[PDB]
């Protein structure tokens, strides 16, 4: 997160960190056994880390659970990043409390102008590299489809949306992928791609989770 | 460098590199990356040539 | 056309050469006043050359008519090449006869396996460079969209089909763009793109004209 603020410990209780020796992506806990992430975050040997604040320090509220299976979207497009959505099953059910909590899936898609919360442990700089250890948060609005396409001509499918600021200075960044965009208490987005970070006219592009509610529901039902 | 290079079949051709890489990227001007570690980056520039592999 | 054969003078009467001082693309005459080409063939100062065989010799049946206007598809995407279709109005109606004839638009899409006629004055070599200069023809079937997407993972939209041969050897090539793919007497495709020419597992990709009949119709009626 570039331009953000320190969330506070466990204030984003659905935020998970994905670990393979190091933090590589985020994800969002949607029930006690399943995490939503980006399909480009696919890796073998994933451990989900819940309850986290400083990811380099065990602070006593963490739960570390290995992934037992990963389900990348059947139509995930590697070249275009269309259908950038993945399901990860926890090998043991997480214990849900005030600091490790599931996040609701949308019943309806979010509209342009709606304010969302974006979070992650990614880079804090739009030029150079500084990685926070504590979780960062960004309040950013959904941008019109029109605004998104004009920023990224020919790159925006119906399974994407832009959120953030055309002026620059406030965005998600590398290390934030897979993590939540939550608006009105529903998981409306997944941190996906951009050109650089927090650059003028280069807003963040996110997976439009509302298009995936029925594949999520049926997939978890039979796995 | 470029491995996968499709081109329109006009004169001149309009070509781009659809290689996904990590580095991004001096020769390239328009380069989109996923927000993971490492990033997955593409050059979405369209040119005359390819380049070679 | 790589791996084709010399058509025979004026045996493909709907075929046109687009000229801006040199042949740069092909096109298809669909009525006395309108040509169908690719959107990527868009160029200012276009002259339509009808009734051609050798594009370097005036042979006595040609009609040269300047474009009065070009209309690129509103949803044409120069990045993905989706909606690669352009309409070109002729400044004066062409005289239709045996050697200059329009081609029927499709009333349904063509299913995979259908044999089609593909033509142009493009490169005849898959490595180097040799231009005909008479019109070359190629008989080639439409490939399944499954084979198409397998050949070009992530690159194929609902507005595209592949045709040709996965073995390589026979294909369209540079200079063939905008030209006809005609199957059972109907314009089913527009020469568009590929990775090289006549390469193994890299067949030609064509604009799926059957998706556009209604736009074509309404655009001609109003311009």
Swiss-Prot record, chains A, C:
InterPro entries the record matches: Peptidase_S1_PA, Peptidase_S1_PA_chymotrypsin, Peptidase_S1A, Serine_Proteases_S1, Trypsin_dom, TRYPSIN_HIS, TRYPSIN_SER
GO molecular function: endopeptidase activity; metal ion binding; serine-type endopeptidase activity; serpin family protein binding
Residues covered by the Peptidase S1 domain: 1-221
Modification note: Subsequent cleavage after Lys-125 leads to alpha-trypsin. Further cleavage after Lys-170 yields pseudotrypsin. A cleavage may also occur after Arg-99.
Main EC class the enzyme belongs to: hydrolase
Activity regulation annotation text: Is inhibited by scorpion cyclotide trypsin inhibitor TopI1.
Cofactor: how bound: Binds 1 Ca(2+) ion per subunit.
Active site: 40 (charge relay system), 84 (charge relay system), 177 (charge relay system)
Keywords (A to Z) from UniProt: Calcium, Digestion, Disulfide bond, Hydrolase, Metal-binding, Protease, Secreted, Serine protease, Signal, Zymogen
Positions contributing to Ca(2+) binding: 52, 54, 57, 62
Family note: Belongs to the peptidase S1 family.
Subunit structure, as described in the record: Interacts with SERPINA1.
Protein name in the entry: Serine protease 1
Naturally occurring in which organism (per UniProt): Bos taurus
Gene name of the record: PRSS1
From Swiss-Prot, chain B:
GO cellular component term, pick one: extracellular region
Keyword line: Disulfide bond, Protease inhibitor, Serine protease inhibitor
Disulfide bridge partners, by residue number: 2-17, 5-50, 7-15, 24-31, 28-43, 33-41
Keyword Disulfide bond included in the entry's annotation: yes
CDD domains noted in UniProt: BBI (cd00023)
InterPro entries in UniProt: Bowman-Birk_prot_inh, Prot_inh_BBI
PROSITE patterns documented for this protein: BOWMAN_BIRK (PS00281)
Residues carrying the site annotation Reactive bond for trypsin: 9-10, 35-36
GO molecular function terms listed in the Swiss-Prot or TrEMBL record: serine-type endopeptidase inhibitor activity
UniProt entry tagged with the keyword Glycoprotein: no
Function: Inhibits trypsin but not chymotrypsin. Inhibits the trypsin-like proteinase activity present in larvae of the crop pests Adoxophyes orana, Hyphantria cunea, Lobesia botrana and Ostrinia nubilalis.
Subunit structure as annotated in this protein's UniProt entry: Forms a monomer at protein concentrations of below 1 mM. At concentrations of above 2 mM, self-associates.
Membership in a protein family: Belongs to the Bowman-Birk serine protease inhibitor family.
Official protein name in the record: Bowman-Birk type proteinase inhibitor
């Amino acid at each position: 997160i570039v331009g953000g603020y320190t969330c506070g410990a466990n204030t984003v209780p659905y935020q998970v960190s994905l670990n393979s020796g190091y933090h590589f992506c985020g994800g969002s806990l949607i029930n006690s056994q399943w995490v939503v992430s980006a399909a480009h975050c696919y890796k073998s040997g994933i451990q989900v880390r819940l309850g986290e604040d400083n990811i380099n320090v065990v602070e006593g509220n963490e739960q570390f659970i290995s992934a037992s299976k990963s389900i990348v979207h059947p139509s995930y497009n590697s070249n275009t990043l269309n259908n950038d959505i993945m399901l990860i099953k926890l090998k043991s059910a997480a214990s849900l409390n005030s600091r490790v909590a599931s996040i609701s899936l949308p019943t309806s898609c979010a509209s342009a102008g709606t304010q969302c919360l974006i979070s992650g442990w990614g880079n804090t700089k739009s030029s150079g590299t500084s990685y926070p250890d504590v979780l960062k948060c960004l309040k950013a609005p959904i941008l019109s489809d029109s605004s998104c396409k004009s920023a990224y001509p020919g790159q925006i499918t119906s399974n994407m949306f832009c959120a953030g600021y055309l002026e620059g200075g406030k965005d998600s960044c590398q290390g934030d992928s897979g993590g939540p965009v939550v608006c009105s208490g529903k998981l409306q987005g997944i941190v996906s791609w951009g050109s650089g970070c927090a650059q003028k006219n280069k807003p963040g592009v996110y997976t439009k989770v509302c298009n995936y509610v029925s594949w999520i529901k049926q997939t978890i039902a039979s796995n | 460098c470029c491995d996968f290079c499709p081109c329109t079949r006009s004169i001149p051709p309009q070509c781009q590199c659809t290689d996904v890489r990590e580095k991004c990227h001096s020769a390239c001007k328009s380069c989109l990356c996923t927000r993971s570690f490492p990033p997955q980056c593409r050059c979405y520039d369209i040119t005359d040539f390819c380049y070679p592999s």
